[PDB]
Amino acid sequence: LNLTKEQHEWLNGWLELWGAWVYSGRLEKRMSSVIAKFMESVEPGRVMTRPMCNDDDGMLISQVVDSVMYIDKKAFGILLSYYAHGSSKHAIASYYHRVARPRKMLCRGGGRIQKPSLATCRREVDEILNASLFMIYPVLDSAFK
DNA sequence: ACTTAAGAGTCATTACCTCTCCATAATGCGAATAGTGTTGCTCATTTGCTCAATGA
Structure with a gap:
């Protein structure tokens, strides 16, 4: 399953406020390591084109996202990207x-080990994004309420 | 009315092998168009799987 429409836009808006918060570099580096090794591949003098949230609410969003997404780095990397x-x-x-290894394909390759197409790549990153939002949402209500 | 000069045109064997060589220069500034990226969406293709008769 997935979320409803109002919950999708609410979580999308809160995550881009949180993304504008971490994009300045105001996240403390001892708190987590995956964002620490994500933010090293970007210049320190970044521009601010998005509205930025304040300190402790962004601290709350950062602590809940690395408490629920500490088991995998690939989906978390898609989320920060x-x-x-x-x-x-x-x-x-x-x-x-353009990167991923050849995989077994069903119903279109017949089991042939081949590279994934662009359409199934868009579909799987959409599925990864929707699954990460479904892991974010009820734990975020548990952190808020 | 016919007879020598001037000028143009068109060829001058076949087959093969090796090597080298085949370019340089006005600037700039908006307007406008073609190109590429983005997101949402539909459609054709194939495959494991399921359902219905039927005789042994």
Whole structure:
């Protein structure tokens, strides 16, 4: 399943506020290590094109996201690539198509070990994004309420 | 009315092998158009799987 429409836009807006918060570099580096090794591949003098949230609410959003997404680094990397840096979904899917190993395909390759197409790459990064938001949402209500 | 000069045109064997060589220069500034990226969406293709008769 997935979320409803109002919950999707609410979580999307809160995550881009949180992404504009971490994009300045105001996250303390001892708190987590995956954002620490994500934010080292970007210049320190970044520009601010998005509205930025305040300190402790962004601290609350950062602590809940690395408490629920501390088991995997790939889906968390997609999340920081879409929301923190601000890259679009199509660029993420194009780079994942240009990198990923040959996989077994069903109902179109007949089991042939081949590279994934761009359409299934867009579909799997959309599924990864929707699954990460479904892991974010009820634990975020548990942190808020 | 016919007879020598001037000028143009068109060829001058076949087959093969090796090597080298085949370019340089006005600037700039908006307007406008073609190109590429983005997101949402539909459509054709294939495959494991399921359902219905039927005789042994």
